C-alpha cells in the first residue's frame, strides 16, 4: 500500500521512490536479520526453518511481482539454505553414528 | 579525526560532507599532518 | 459529384447534364477499374502461390490418416483470405470485402479445380484413402459463400475418377462427421468468414 | 543556430558515446568472471562440463539491456553502438582473456563451449552481419587449444588477425607449453619440447610474418 500510486505527488522519481524504500529497509534490517539468522542459526533449527524459507521465499517471490528484490532475497535465503546444509549435515551420519555403534 | 581505523565512513556521514568531497578522508588536511600515510586514496 | 452536379444546376440552368460530362465519371469508372483490379491482382498473385502448397506433396502418394482437416491447401489460402478481409472490413465495410470475397471464391475454386485433373485417376499416388481427404478439404470451402461457387465446388467433387459413383456421394455424406470435427477445431479462426 | 544545433549534435555524440562505453565496459567488466574463474584447470579437470556463471550473467543482462534499449530509443543507433562495441570488445576480450593460467585440454572444450555460447549471444543481438569474432576468437582460442607447432606455423600464415601475436603466439606457446609445463611433476617439465619451443620460439614463433622476432 505504498505503490498504489496515481503517480506522482513527489514526483521523484517518476515511479521510482519505493524502490529506495524497500531498498533501504532491505539494507539496514539486512545485517540485523543476518545475525538473527546466524546467531540464531542455532535458533533457526532444522525444524520450521523449512517453514521460515517457506514463509520467506513466497514473500521473496510475490513481491511487486518483483521490484529490485535481490540481495536480501538471493543472499539471505541462500545463507538459509547454507544453514539447512550444515544443520542437516551434522544431523546426517554423524547423527547416525549409532549405526557406527 | 581520520586516523588509520576511523577515516572512511565516519567521514562519509550525513553532515560529515562538511568535510571535503575528496578531502573527506583528508578532513585533517586542515591540520599540520594531513591524514597519516596516503590521504588521497578516495577520489580515484 | 452527382449531387455536386445537381446542386451545380442551381442558378445554372445549363441543362444539368449531358452525362458525356460524366465521361469523367466513366474515367472514374476506369479509375475504379484500375483500383480494385490492382489489389485483386496481387492477392490473386499471392493466391497463385497457393499452388506451391497443394501441388507439392499434397494429393501425392497420400495415406492422409484422417487428419480433420490437414488441408494446408485450403488452410493458408483461407488464412490470407481472412487476412485481407480482416484488415479492411472496418472502413471499407461491404466494399470488395464482399465483392472480392466472391471473386476470391471464384479464383480459389478454379485454380483449385484444375489440380484434380492430373490425379484424375482417383487414388494418386496413394489417395485411395486421401480420396476422402480431398473430399474433406473440398468440403472445407462451405463456410459462408454463394451457390454457383458451390456449384463449381460440387463440379470439382465429380472431377476425379471416383468422383463418379454415388458411393462417393453418400460415402462423403457419411464422412461428414470428421468435417464437423474440423468445424470445431478449427472453428474460431475462419469463423470470421461467416 | 548552427552553434546551437552544433552543440546539440555534440551532446548526441557524447550521449550515444556514453551508452556504447557503458555496454562495452559492461562486457569487459563481465569478462572478469574469468578473474578468477577459480583455477581454469591444468591439462584437464575432467569432467569439465559448464559454464562459468558470470558469463551467463553477461548473456543475461546483455539480453535484457538490449531489450530495454530496443524499447526506449530508436533502432539505428542501437544497432550501431551495440554492433561495433559488442563485436570488437568480444574479440579483444578474448585477446586479453588469453592471459590466464596453465591450460586444460578438457577446459579447452569448456572455455571453447562458453566462447561459442557468447558467440551465440552477441549473435543473438545480431548475427546476419559479420559475426566473425565467433570465427576469429573461436579458431584463435581453439588455436590456443591447438598445441601443434606445425599448426602454429600453418595458422597465422593463413588467418588470424591476431595483432597481439607477441602475447598470442607466446600464449599458444604457453598452451602447448601449458600442457608441457605440468605434463609431469617434480618437473613439470624438462622444457625439451620447450627447447623445441625455444627453437620454435625462434622458428615457429620468430618467423613472425617477415618481422621475424617473436
Amino acid at each position: 500500500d505504498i505503490n498504489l500510486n496515481k503517480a506522482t505527488e513527489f514526483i521523484l522519481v517518476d515511479n521510482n521512490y519505493n524502490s529506495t524504500n524497500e531498498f533501504w529497509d532491505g539494507l539496514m534490517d539486512r545485517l540485523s536479520p543476518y545475525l538473527s539468522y546466524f546467531i540464531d542459526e542455532k535458533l533457526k533449527t532444522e525444524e520450521d526453518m523449512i517453514k521460515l524459507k517457506d514463509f520467506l521465499c513466497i514473500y521473496v517471490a510475490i513481491l511487486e511481482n518483483f521490484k529490485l528484490n535481490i540481495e536480501p532475497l538471493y543472499k539471505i535465503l541462500v545463507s538459509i539454505f547454507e544453514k539447512f546444509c550444515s544443520v542437516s549435515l551434522r544431523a546426517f551420519d554423524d547423527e547416525f553414528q549409532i549405526l557406527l555403534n | 579525526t581520520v586516523q588509520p581505523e576511523l577515516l572512511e565512513s565516519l567521514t562519509k556521514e550525513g553532515h560529515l560532507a562538511d568535510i571535503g568531497r575528496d578531502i573527506i578522508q583528508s578532513y585533517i588536511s586542515n591540520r599540520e599532518d594531513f591524514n597519516h600515510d596516503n590521504f588521497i586514496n578516495s577520489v580515484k | 459529384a452527382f449531387p455536386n452536379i445537381l446542386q451545380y444546376f442551381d442558378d445554372a440552368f445549363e441543362w444539368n447534364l449531358a452525362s458525356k460530362n460524366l465521361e469523367l465519371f466513366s474515367l472514374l469508372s476506369k479509375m475504379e477499374s484500375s483500383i480494385f483490379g490492382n489489389y485483386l491482382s496481387d492477392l490473386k498473385i499471392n493466391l497463385r502461390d497457393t499452388l506451391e502448397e497443394k501441388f507439392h506433396e499434397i494429393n501425392w502418394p497420400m495415406y492422409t490418416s484422417n487428419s480433420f482437416r490437414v488441408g494446408d491447401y485450403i488452410i493458408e489460402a483461407l488464412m490470407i483470405l481472412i487476412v485481407v478481409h480482416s484488415e479492411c472490413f472496418r472502413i471499407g465495410p461491404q466494399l470488395i470485402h464482399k465483392i472480392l470475397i466472391e471473386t476470391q471464391i471464384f479464383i480459389a475454386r478454379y485454380l483449385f479445380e484444375a489440380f484434380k485433373p492430373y490425379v484424375g485417376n482417383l487414388s494418386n499416388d496413394g489417395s485411395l484413402q486421401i480420396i476422402v481427404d480431398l473430399e474433406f478439404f473440398q468440403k472445407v470451402m462451405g463456410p459462408l459463400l454463394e451457390k454457383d461457387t458451390e456449384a463449381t465446388l460440387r463440379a470439382c467433387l465429380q472431377n476425379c475418377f471416383q468422383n463418379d459413383t454415388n458411393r462417393l456421394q453418400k460415402c462423403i455424406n457419411e464422412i461428414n462427421p470428421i468435417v464437423s470435427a474440423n468445424l470445431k477445431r478449427t472453428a474460431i479462426q475462419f469463423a470470421a468468414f461467416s | 543556430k548552427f552553434d546551437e544545433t552544433i552543440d546539440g549534435f555534440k551532446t548526441l555524440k557524447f550521449k550515444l558515446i556514453t551508452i556504447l562505453r557503458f555496454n562495452i565496459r559492461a562486457l569487459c567488466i563481465y569478462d572478469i568472471g574469468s578473474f578468477f574463474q577459480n583455477t581454469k584447470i591444468w591439462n584437464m579437470d575432467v569432467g569439465s562440463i559448464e559454464l562459468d556463471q558470470n558469463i551467463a550473467s553477461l548473456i543475461s543482462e546483455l539480453r535484457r539491456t538490449e531489450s530495454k534499449l530496443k524499447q526506449q530509443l530508436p533502432e539505428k543507433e542501437k544497432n550501431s553502438i551495440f554492433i561495433g562495441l559488442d563485436i570488437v570488445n568480444n574479440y579483444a576480450l578474448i585477446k586479453g582473456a588469453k592471459s590466464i593460467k596453465v591450460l586444460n585440454h578438457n577446459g579447452i572444450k569448456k572455455m571453447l563451449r562458453n566462447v561459442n555460447v557468447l558467440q551465440h549471444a552477441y549473435r543473438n543481438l545480431s548475427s546476419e552481419p559479420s559475426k566473425i569474432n565467433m570465427n576469429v576468437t573461436m579458431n584463435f582460442y581453439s588455436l590456443c587449444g591447438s598445441s601443434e607447432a606445425e599448426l602454429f606455423e600453418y595458422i597465422k600464415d593463413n588467418e588470424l588477425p591476431h595483432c597481439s601475436v607477441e602475447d598470442l603466439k607466446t600464449i599458444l606457446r604457453l598452451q602447448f607449453s601449458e600442457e608441457m609445463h605440468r605434463q609431469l611433476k617434480r618437473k613439470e617439465q624438462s622444457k625439451e619440447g620447450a627447447r623445441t619451443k625455444i627453437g620454435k620460439l625462434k622458428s615457429k614463433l620468430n618467423a613472425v610474418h617477415t618481422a621475424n622476432e617473436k
Partner: protein, 97 residues
C-alpha cells in the same frame, strides 16, 4: 558527476582522446565498418591495461560501473535529445528567418 570525489569513473576515464576522438570518428557514421580493433582494443584496453584483464585482475565487474538507475536516466535523456534534434534542429529556415 566529475568532480571525481570520490569515484574512479572508468567510463569517464574512458572519455579521453584520441580514443574519445577516434571514438567520435567511431561515432562519425558511427564508424562505417572500420570498427578498428586498433582503436577499440587500444583505447578500450588502454586504461584497461591496468590489470589488464588480468590475470588475476585489479579491475571491473562492479568496480564503478554506472548503476541501472543512471542507465535509465542516460537512456531517457538520450531519447530526449533524439526527439529534440529533429523537431528543434529543423527550423533553421535560411538564414535568419
Amino acid at each position: 558527476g566529475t568532480s571525481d570525489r570520490h569515484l574512479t569513473r572508468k567510463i569517464i576515464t574512458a572519455w579521453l582522446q584520441n580514443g574519445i576522438l577516434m571514438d567520435q570518428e567511431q561515432k562519425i557514421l558511427n564508424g562505417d565498418e572500420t570498427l578498428f580493433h586498433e582503436e577499440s582494443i587500444e583505447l578500450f584496453k588502454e586504461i584497461p591495461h591496468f590489470y589488464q584483464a588480468g590475470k588475476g585482475l585489479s579491475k571491473s565487474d562492479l568496480f564503478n560501473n554506472l548503476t541501472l538507475d543512471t542507465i535509465l536516466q542516460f537512456s531517457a535523456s538520450v531519447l530526449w535529445i533524439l526527439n529534440w534534434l529533429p523537431g528543434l534542429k529543423k527550423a533553421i529556415n535560411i538564414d535568419e528567418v
